[PDB]
Write a protein that binds this ligand. Structure first.
Ligand SMILES: [Cl-]
Ligand SMILES: [Cl-]
Ligand SMILES: [Cl-]
Lengths: 661, 661, 328
């Protein structure tokens, strides 16, 4: 009667329903059928039904236990059949879902499991539009869960069935209400519910209640926990969590158990001073991250989540906006573990500069959106990293006006979880900005026209006109191809096929200086940590890509901007990085070299001869001007001070040719 | 206060939602966006959202009237917006639907009408599968209807709002209950409802009732009609209909009016003797017809319906199965007018020899199917041609078992309309065959393997084992390309790229002889009158086509089988037709020539010299054997008897070459 | 079949230029040039004995810009004359200048009244060219206009050529006006409608569907004859009696004052509306009968035209007249 969790990812048989013959090919999960077409820039990539079928041997000894199929994510509608009989449907591409199959299987034989996944367009399931790909299929894990007939229920919106509600938290004491779903299919009886909080081998809490469970009972039980002088989850400084074991016992035997983290903290956002974690001001040095990657689409493996977090911590990221939808439980686990303050959001996404709408005013759309919000909150309730619930991105009032509906979602979020503030990401003026507790804007001053300086004007004017708003920046960024390089700085056309890397570097340096000076801005999030898929894009070095990443789509190459942020945000790892190394061909008679470093100064050498030292500025940048190259090959080297220095080096070619002038 | 019906077909602006930019092109309705891709055999043709927008000037003098947008058909989900505000959704590709826009428009200015049509795959809207194309878009007319504030309601499942229920019909007298929907938006008041039955200028009935109408009233009123010694709608012999005018009057002014046909008849099907219309046995010489055509897809214009009916009457068709879905009101009008007994059906279509299912056992699918059935019955209630309601085609029990659900549809059909029997088209053994009042099978003996003789064995054995069944043949046919010709008769592989026209001719001649001898078979329907689109097909002379038509897809060329049926079914138009004229190259030393004619004999000439007369057989066929051709060109001519004969003629080339033997 | 039926035939090699599109019909390299000569020799030798062939066409719409094919076209002309001195050479041009002065007969592709302008500029072009270059034997190698049989409107208005609206009445009007210009100019040795049939051109995005050049007088499947076909039939096939009512596919009428038009080989015709005669009208020089200010009754109207005599030919249509609309 130990709970079992059996992965069912291997060897499914797949075909599209547009293939009428019935032949199938082997696939293995996680899987999307849009990893080739959408990623090649095909705008009308396959959106429709793909069918996955697998034989599952139901063990004779599972008779008398309860059996559940839990899906971590299927985009975007899933219809599940056991022995070809429909058992249920889930509508929504990003939340987990579960079906009990206990009474639906034949014990001691192979049973068919068939999943018919549909990512076809709909007007009743958010997201309706967006600058990303709606990759179809079973792109997260599938599990067979086996439990006692009397269990901690897995059936409440596919959540772990335990909510560790933080009611009061300070360094003196924490009070928590452990709410636990119980489900009984055995005879009427009683059981003992135990909640055990530990830190390593040390017991911190232990609470018990006897509970009466009628046959067919599905009930919520609540146990208070008190922890004196708690160790708090304090972001990257100390991402500490207790372990909580919730178990059911009968006549001296444990019959079921689940574990969840408890990371205690408290926070607030001040309109003038920014974000405070556990009573201390904390600048939120944030980036955004989509759940896709080159070649595999959104069919991410655990090492992919692991590498994305490793790259963010290397850069000194301490905040993340996991846009534009609920992401993997494992990704939120890694945010908990590494101390990253997380903004998690539902996929209520508007059109941006494109056509159509994020909101369609019909009951089916509205009720589904509420179910997606409840899923997000209940499924991910216990992650201390999550400190904001995001309710939308770039909705607009024209046509169907989502204002009243967004007020409904806000009230529902506050009722489900009074312990986190709501937030949203806006690109509009007006009423949509005054609903959520924190507000943020997506700003591209210096990329989509204008100069970075208009970001400063916007922030200052907004803060002065509306002093009660807690203002953030939910997106800012600029495109870059690592293969587009030029000696001189000039602003490219955003929508064109030329995105020189130096303009992205310049964009981030100027925008960051504006942000750094404005502590009323509670958090800022770079769009985006990685290049990502968007099939309709036709810009930069190839179609189908949003190239605003600080790192490329395959996670292989860090663009110059990554190191500018690393020098400024990760000050305890010594480093020096020469900018513009991918610009190998130089034409300008007067060369400028620039390095990012954590050192107070650096020295430049050209062809083995020192050009002398320069001091790092407040933004960890060292600059040498009017450097003279010799025609042909030149070796450029920068070094930090001391007898054991760090170095960076490049060979460039200097050419006096051109073109008219 | 005359009712206005304004066509809104011209000059809409279209784009796909996968085109994110917002640019549009002009289109004109009727329109499908699948007339090129699906018709070229692209199996993954575009299934998703297409958007149509048009400015509609709302006249200041329409203020005080009621305004309705009525759509004859949008495949398969339509979401309608006025000034970009959602007003409603319709789910189902084949039934009409309507929205009142009276209170939703700005009078005296241009208002936007936006229709977002979606033909993306769904598992909750029949048809889920089928051997035809699911052409997307606004493929039938759109109308703006303008009425008095007090009107005969257009809002009951978009029907005309009048049901002329035939309660008793004989040559001595007919009793009819005129059920009329009334809708009032003006102040509380009374009005006079009048029902006027006419034949040309002669008044046959006139009945009146005063009715009390509360503000906001939507009520059903019923007036009895009695017609003594009625003229009955008697099929092609006398397709007579009365005209019925239903009108509302107030203080000596007519305020609203609608007209509907009244074609009185009675019928029954006997298990041993077949179908009886108005007390007289009537063999049902039937064909099936899909609502598509070459080049335009299902975006049919009225001349297309007109030509299809003209071709069927030319062939002597007196029965039709309008498969596999509710078809145009105009097509049922033409069936009424021409006397064609009609089987009309909902799109509850199963997979046939292909994968997947026609039934998914979930409430959303089931409730939508009932709404599609109610639509079909209410919208098309008054057409005398419709004598059967078809509930499914080729469902199967394996997996989700639709038996109980089909019993629900049968009971709903009988409750909505006790005056027509239900029927269905089966390809299975077992319980699915015992639900509807009449049953029929789809049979391809001599095409999908076997010999036509196994059709005879099936019919005889079924009739003997189940003597209570009213057995029909809902499909029988064989493929043919007019470009595949060979001198000798040999059975081709059905699924191959060689469909010689002579095999189709042979198939129909043999199958028809089996049918003609079996009067217990109440109706038989050729699959199909026309070649039609099915993108997944890969057989005959080109992909994407089901080539079982007696006439080609563009309606241009009648295949030999058409004339075999014409000679046998249209005996009052004199004709002679030489078979195998498209087979221009002859190799066999001993040639056979065959003609179909209404004459008792015919004479063959070869190179201007008579080969003598031969008698027509019982099936209107004349055959000459061992005809000797001379090497090279030969002129072959056949003539009917008399001094003013009808002729047919062809030049063939006889070659003594070949290939081994 | 051209031999058998007596049809004078212009047969040509595929030396085709870009028209209004990109790229070139000529690339100046020996491999291209030698292959073109082999294609010309093939055409002449393989088809030498057909009496119907009376002209050898050497190109269609080449242009001088870039690789200049003038000298090479002179080579092809000399080769044609050496292979077959018994037929003249010809070509189809859309340019001014030297390309027009090589072949014995010359012709132009003209779309006045379709690709902008009015048909009247065809008359100006023909007259001015003939006067400035009196030695040229001038023909019209293409003239035409697009039409979908599914695009119909009550009023005559010029559509955008490259757009998705090609009303059949504009094609009818185009051919009637252009033909009148041609008929009056006997110095024009031959004129050739572009085209007898709609045909395939995958890059086209106009008329009622992509991938089609819809300038045919008959549709692509050969099933439907457009109104212009019967205008030409009445004027060119005068020994088969006929009457044809124009605009029958325009079933919905809105104009208060209706005009009906018939093409016939008869000297006059009579119109009936709802079974009542509107009287006879005379056919003009171009075999056209016209009735103006015909009054329809709201709803269905039966329109019938008949030729004179006790055994007449007839044509008939039912239209629907509607007083609705749109602002005005
Ligand atoms: Cl929106
Ligand atoms: Cl089925
Ligand atoms: Cl050229």
């Amino acid at each position: 009667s130990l709970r079992q969790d059996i992965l069912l990812n291997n060897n499914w048989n797949f075909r599209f329903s547009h293939q009428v013959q019935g032949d199938t090919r082997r696939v293995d999960l996680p899987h999307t059928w849009n990893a080739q077409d959408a990623l090649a820039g095909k705008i009308d990539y396959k959106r429709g039904i793909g069918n996955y079928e697998k034989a599952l041997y139901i063990r004779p000894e599972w008779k008398g236990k309860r059996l559940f199929l839990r899906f971590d994510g299927v985009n975007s509608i899933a219809d599940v059949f056991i022995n070809r009989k429909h058992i249920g449907e889930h509508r929504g591409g990003y939340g987990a879902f579960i079906f009990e199959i206990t009474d639906l299987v034949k014990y001691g034989e192979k049973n068919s499991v068939l999943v018919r996944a549909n990512n076809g367009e709909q007007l009743d399931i958010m997201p309706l539009v967006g600058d990303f790909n709606f990759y179809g299929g079973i792109y997260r894990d599938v599990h067979l869960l086996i439990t006692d007939e009397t269990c901690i229920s897995p059936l409440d919106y596919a959540s772990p069935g335990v909510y560790l509600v933080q009611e009061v938290v300070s360094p003196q004491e924490a009070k928590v209400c452990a709410k636990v779903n119980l489900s009984n299919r055995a005879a009427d009886g009683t059981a003992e519910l135990q909640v055990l909080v530990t830190d390593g081998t040390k017991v911190i809490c232990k609470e018990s209640r006897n509970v009466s469970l009628k046959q067919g009972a599905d009930i919520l039980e609540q146990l208070p926990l008190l922890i004196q002088k708690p160790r708090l989850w304090n972001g990257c400084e100390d991402p500490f969590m207790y372990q909580v074991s919730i178990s059911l016992h009968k006549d001296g035997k444990q019959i079921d158990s689940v574990t969840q983290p408890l990371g205690l903290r408290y926070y607030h956002t001040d309109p003038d001073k920014g974000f405070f974690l556990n009573g201390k001001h904390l600048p939120l040095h944030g980036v955004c991250r989509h759940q896709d990657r080159a070649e595999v689409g959104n069919a991410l493996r655990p090492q992919h989540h692991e590498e994305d977090v490793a790259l963010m911590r290397e850069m000194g990221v301490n905040a993340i906006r996991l846009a534009h939808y609920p992401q993997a439980t494992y990704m939120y686990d890694l945010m908990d573990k590494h101390g990253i303050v997380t903004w998690a959001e539902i996929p209520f996404v508007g059109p941006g500069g494109y056509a159509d709408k994020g909101f369609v005013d019909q009951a089916s759309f509205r009720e589904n959106g509420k179910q997606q919000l409840i899923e997000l909150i209940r499924q991910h309730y216990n992650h201390p990293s999550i400190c904001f619930w995001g309710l939308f991105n770039e909705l607009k009032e024209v046509g169907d006006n989502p204002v009243e509906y967004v007020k409904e979602l806000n009230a529902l979020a506050k009722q489900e979880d009074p312990t986190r503030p709501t937030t949203s990401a806006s690109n509009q003026d007006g009423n949509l900005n005054f609903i959520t507790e924190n507000i943020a804007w997506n700003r591209y001053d210096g990329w989509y026209g204008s100069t970075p300086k208009t970001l400063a004007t916007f922030l200052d004017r907004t803060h002065k006109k509306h002093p009660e708003l807690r203002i953030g920046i939910s997106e800012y960024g600029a495109g870059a191809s690592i293969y587009h390089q030029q000696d001189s700085l000039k602003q490219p056309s955003a929508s064109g096929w030329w995105h020189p890397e130096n303009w992205q570097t310049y964009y981030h340096m100027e925008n960051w200086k504006i942000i750094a000076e404005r502590p009323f801005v509670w958090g800022t999030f770079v769009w985006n940590m990685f290049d990502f898929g968007a099939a309709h894009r036709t810009e930069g070095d190839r179609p189908g890509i949003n190239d605003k990443g600080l790192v490329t789509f395959d996670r292989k190459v860090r663009k110059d901007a990554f190191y500018f942020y690393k020098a400024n945000w990760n000050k305890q790892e010594p480093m020096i990085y020469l900018a513009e190394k991918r610009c190998r061909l130089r034409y300008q008679p007067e060369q400028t070299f620039m390095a990012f470093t954590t050192a107070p100064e650096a020295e430049l050498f050209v062809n083995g001869v020192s050009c002398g030292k320069q001091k790092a500025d407040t933004y960890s940048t060292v600059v040498w001007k009017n450097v003279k190259l010799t025609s042909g090959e030149n070796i450029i080297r920068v070094t930090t001070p001391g007898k054991k220095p760090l170095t960076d080096e490049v060979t460039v070619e200097y050419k006096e040719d051109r073109h008219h002038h």
